[PDB]
Design a protein around this ligand. Structure first.
Ligand code: HEM
Ligand code: HEM
Lengths: 727, 727
């Protein structure tokens, strides 16, 4: 019929387009030809639409889908309208339980491939041949807020990877900091209850700036290392593409001869590390609560695929007690300076889902999903987790057959004698459902352990001790690893940590709790302690001033791997720039600007006060992407204002604030020709200053200064200036 | 033990305190003596804590609640730790399904009481005697976002009241606008799917500014009246206390002689009507996503109880076809100018819950929960709703016994022969579970209909027609009631509607959809059409310019009841003012200011750049409530800056922006003495201007000008000025 516009404009191009150039689509429709083995096997449950009749779930076609069956057109609805009651019953039952933690979350499809065979250290088939690529499904998440919460909150992010391997599913479920808050799994409910919304009134959402959180931190000094990380810029990332990932426990790699190696897993972001600053990150949860979900979907549609390196920290079994921290302690990190991360392979995320609920919401990831070649250790938080993620699926996913939900199915064979349970999909033809059996000659059969394709056998570690509910004395140290983290931060990074604690703590209503947290900080480092204390109006006791600092970590004084900005690495590719238009824009400026950006892989948004299009001075028509208020500075990386009829936007409060917000959030600002009038707005010396690129015309060098600032992410040197600005 | 601070400061005072003066508490603990019949009956399921041992759910006391049972303190956790597995199993299963619509929501306890007996019109016992007070439970809600979404979004709000009456539960489930979007319940799934997050990527949250929403509006002209309301300031309220509520369908009141009267239900806010402005409302979902949940909890703890008048629009059965709109059409409002709202009683909300999940999340409200004295009509949206809210509880609340969940239980008797089903609490001693029966002599027995305490009998309306799925021709008019709404708006109210449509529509990526919505507006009113069109770069076709406007509604040209601000009514009580401190504040100013505010019932927040306390010039100690960045202007109603050492905050970017944001959001600003220096910031004539109160000292008249502006809510006359401000 019509309803569709002919000119075809309702459908997106099935090819990479920049951010916001087209409506977004289902994966299959946007990228018909990105295939892999898991993607192809879901084909049996994909449903199309075009040229199909509207039906009931029982196949009966519907003639009127606008009206209920009533006795006369102004009369009562009849109980025999089965078409209406089916349509409203399925609506009434749409929602399943959300994840009790990590409910927010965004996922994509892609693959893993090893750099070389690691057969010398593990008999794990997915790592056995550099030529073997493995389908993955990855979901990035926050920790506290429900699925309806905002993306750019201050929190730990999760990073879960499902590996569809030839010998089983290996789920590597980690987060973006290398230590957790708790040593023992028995305390997990108390910690999650304390971070979560408070019981009486369910406030706050997506925030730890509340009394109970900080109450439990002050009473539990083991939480302090990971609270330091959450209080850093590490707690507000720019993108899921711009963060590290970590498995946090020590695991084992078992090779074909039986040798066990301890390992810790890392994910290194090939786009560099980068974070937002808090005023930006907080305002942006109001301006776009879906910023992280949006930008991942769109990087993949523009072809700016996310890529990460899998990296191992290997430690021989003999060195188990070589460090002055316990390797099985989850609140201790292993400094890369002591043990290096060896890069093992690479992961590429290159396809979005077709249906968020079906693929993303129904995905089950559990750390107990290991394969031959891997094994667990006695880490007390890892041992408890193992109980949990099988259990939780019985209500979230309705039952013991969650592995039959299509995103979760092994792409390799699985046969065993488990029968029945809710929405059992497999019809078992085996005459036996028990072993040992003679009637189907004992099939399916047990397999002995071996080098390739053998059964799972656990590593025969020796256990001796009594049945005790008791914490190991080796776990008893709470302060050298937070001070190592603190000392490895650049100065503006440390500022930002002071300010993180000061904001959060200002929101605790009960002052004894805030004092209790400053006492703990004085055991880490007094400078840190004094700075936070000051913002809160607290004085340190001369005794607090005489607390002796913790020891070094194996004589290490700092490790720069723990900082985000100290050793620089920066994608300018896939970043986004806002260009502020006016009604007679100088095309000379504009075609130079856009060419430069295109060569580097950077996306532009042409922004105005009205939608529709303006016309450059040469009569070129430029379509406007958003208004100044519609796409705030908050959502880009740099602002460029070309020359032209400047008088048009000069008096506009929105165009001027666009620049003041951006200035304050430490972003590069480039002013060509008369656009330099706005220096007077953000208060700049005619003599100039760093981070403001200015010139007579937009050209090659002007763009070079801009892209160079952009590779450096923010102009940190401006931090003294930005305090006098009211924005 | 300790952990508690002695000085007692961890516990709040069990008496009314202002906003933020104390930590908030459970209802029982904050207000031990606000009782009512429903509150007292929940006493059988309230659980205390103090002086009690920590136990398992089976009563076994726990000695170590910090550690798991392991074979040696660095060894594996044992499967026989039943204490650990119970604690983690209940955690694993915390979450039930959320409401498929209206999932966000905030609730409180209180009562209803009639002004007089309405026995002449209804035999409904809760309305029979002015001396009969009825327990209510009320939940205010949004419509689109999940339970983790933000409170101050642009959306319709719900307003659901559970009346615990002597003859059954009467649930009056309504919203805050008087018409709905859809005529027939069969379309409800298509409309909710179109407003909701889009299927492929689940964006956006809490927003209708997306293509599918506006696609379905342009193709469905019956949605246009209620979209006008959502696009007005009516879609962003200041508080749940500052809005009207409506049942939207025509219902029947049946008296003891059998006479039926049609009725429409209203709730009139005794604090006046008031809304936020969009930049404010949007930024505030970032700055405090729980603003509406918070402020309701705290009005009730300060004793600023919410109060509403129940009001009836009665129409005799004979006048059923007297209007030129169908009374059974849910997209048509009945102008108060044609039919007056008669005030029937009053409702007071005076007690918060003890446990949000238990009381609020498990509450089931359904419109089919009517009592004797009330009945339904053939409204096609009301008839479908009736199916739905029984159905949805079978998964949300796990089963057919949701009425046994304590918040939902009748406070009056209920006995019948329904047996079994999941978490059946009642043990039935009746030897029979069927009627007719002789073995328990037919008890419980059927009751005949009568004037008081009789059985439910339906009104014997005549039905004649054929079984047809067909819409009545009387429902076919889509445009005079949106133009009546439009013409009844003040000029700045209409501005705000233009700007609502222009923002939302700028976020549709597909331009043909935006054009399609402007065509529809040109059928309502051309001024409206031209304004929106302009912001979007769209030109109206000369044919669009020649569309004939819709007819009047029964010769009515405007009704001022449809505007928020035209006839003024304003609580200054319970509003909140921010006072910007400095380090030598003049106490003369301050004690005058706070006395004035206290006499009017207005709450102050003393705000500084640091927490702790400053000292007035006379050595008074003032404790600081938040920082300027911690409690933004966004969260108060007016700003007062007293005199003192102004030089201290004058150069502070935060203190200056605090004033520019507030200025722009049209709030009253009061400057005493040297504080008038800041006029230079917000750019004011020395000669002064309206809405900026200024003087040599804070005194009686200065405060009078301020409270008077405050009773008028915003300074609408500033709207021409605020465009040049960059904030
Ligand atoms: C090193 C510490 C931990 C890390 C790195 C971690 C990581 C994660 C991640 C990334 C998810 C999100 C799953 C998804 O995206 O679907 C998750 C879910 C969950 N975690 Fe943890 N977690 C940790 C500790 C714990 C502990 C101690 C428990 C339980 C005793 C626990 C229980 C769960 C459960 C029940 C879920 C929801 C499970 C599901 O939906 O399948 N986690 N965790
Ligand atoms: C005049 C139009 C309508 C109004 C005023 C209205 C109002 C409401 C309100 C206020 C709630 C929130 C309940 C709570 O706070 O717990 C609600 C829930 C709900 N509504 Fe509506 N609604 C309307 C139309 C519809 C229609 C046509 C359907 C179904 C065919 C529907 C289905 C539901 C369901 C299934 C829920 C969740 C029910 C529950 O949780 O108990 N509503 N509605």
């Amino acid at each position: 019929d019509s309803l569709a516009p002919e000119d075809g404009s309702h459908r997106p191009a099935a090819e990479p387009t920049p951010p916001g150039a087209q409506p977004t689509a289902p994966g299959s429709l946007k990228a018909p030809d990105t295939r892999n083995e898991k993607l192809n096997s879901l084909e049996d449950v994909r449903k199309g639409s075009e040229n199909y009749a509207l039906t009931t779930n029982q196949g009966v076609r519907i003639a009127d889908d606008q009206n209920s069956l009533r006795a006369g057109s102004r009369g009562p609805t009849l109980l025999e309208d089965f078409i209406l009651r089916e349509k409203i019953t399925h609506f009434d039952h749409e929602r399943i339980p959300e994840r009790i933690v990590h409910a927010r979350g965004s996922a994509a499809h892609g693959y893993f491939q090893p750099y070389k065979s690691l057969s010398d250290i593990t008999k794990a088939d997915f790592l056995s041949d550099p030529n073997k690529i493995t389908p993955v499904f990855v979901r990035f998440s926050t920790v506290q807020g429900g699925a309806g919460s905002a993306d750019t909150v201050r929190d730990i992010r999760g990073f879960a990877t499902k590996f569809y391997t030839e010998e089983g599913i290996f789920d590597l479920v980690g987060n973006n900091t290398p230590i957790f808050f708790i040593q023992d799994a028995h305390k997990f409910p108390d910690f999650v209850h304390a971070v979560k919304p408070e019981p009486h009134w369910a406030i706050p959402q997506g925030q730890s700036a509340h009394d109970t959180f900080w109450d439990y931190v002050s009473l539990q000094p083991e939480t302090l290392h990971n609270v330091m990380w959450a209080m850093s810029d590490r707690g507000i990332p720019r993108s899921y593409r711009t963060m590290e990932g970590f498995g946090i426990h020590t695991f084992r790699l078992i090779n074909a001869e039986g040798k066990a190696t301890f390992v810790r897993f890392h994910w290194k972001p090939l786009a560099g590390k980068a974070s937002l600053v808090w005023d930006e990150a907080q305002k942006l949860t109001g301006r776009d609560p879906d910023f992280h979900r949006r930008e991942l979907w769109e990087a993949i549609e523009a072809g700016d695929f996310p890529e990460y390196e899998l990296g191992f920290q290997l430690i021989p079994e003999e060195d188990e007690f070589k460090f002055d921290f316990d390797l099985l302690d989850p609140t201790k990190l292993i400094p890369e300076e002591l043990v290096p991360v060896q890069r093992v392979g690479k992961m590429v995320l290159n396809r979005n889902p077709d249906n968020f609920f079906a693929e993303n919401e129904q995905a089950a990831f559990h750390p107990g999903h290991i394969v031959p070649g891997l094994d667990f250790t006695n880490d007390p938080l890892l041992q408890g987790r193992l109980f949990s993620y099988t259990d939780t699926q019985i209500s979230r996913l309705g039952g013991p057959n969650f592995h039959e939900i299509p995103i979760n199915r092994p792409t390799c064979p699985y046969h065993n004698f488990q029968r029945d349970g809710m929405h059992r999909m497999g019809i078992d033809t085996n005459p036996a459902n028990y072993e040992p059996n003679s009637i189907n000659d004992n099939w399916p059969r047990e397999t002995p352990p071996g080098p390739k394709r053998g059964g799972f056998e656990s590593y025969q570690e020796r256990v001796e001790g009594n049945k005790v509910r008791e914490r190991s004395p080796s776990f008893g140290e709470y302060y050298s690893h937070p001070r190592l983290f603190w000392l490895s931060q650049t100065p503006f990074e440390q500022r930002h940590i002071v300010d993180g604690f000061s904001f959060e703590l200002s929101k605790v209503v009960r002052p004894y709790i805030r004092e209790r947290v400053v006492d703990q900080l004085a055991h880490i480092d007094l400078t840190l302690a004094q700075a936070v204390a000051k913002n809160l109006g607290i004085e340190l006791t001369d005794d607090q001033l005489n607390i002796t600092p913790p020891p070094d970590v194996n004589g290490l004084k700092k490790d720069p791997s723990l900082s985000l900005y100290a050793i620089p690495d920066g994608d300018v590719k896939g970043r986004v720039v806002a260009i502020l238009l006016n009604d007679e824009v100088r095309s000379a400026d504009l075609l130079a600007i856009l060419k430069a950006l295109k060569a580097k892989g950077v996306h532009a948004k042409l922004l105005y006060s009205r939608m529709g299009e303006v016309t450059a001075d040469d009569g070129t028509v430029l379509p406007i992407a958003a208004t100044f208020a519609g796409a705030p500075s908050l959502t880009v990386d740099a602002v460029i204002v070309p020359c032209g009829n400047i008088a048009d936007i000069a008096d506009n409060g929105d165009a001027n604030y666009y620049l003041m917000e951006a200035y304050k959030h430490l972003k590069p600002i480039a002013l060509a020709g008369d656009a330099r009038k706005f220096k007077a707005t953000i208060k700049i010396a005619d003599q100039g200053e760093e981070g403001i690129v200015e010139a007579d015309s937009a050209d090659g060098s002007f763009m070079d200064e801009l892209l160079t600032l952009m590779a450096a992410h923010r102009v940190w040197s401006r931090i003294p200036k930005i305090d006098k600005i009211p924005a």
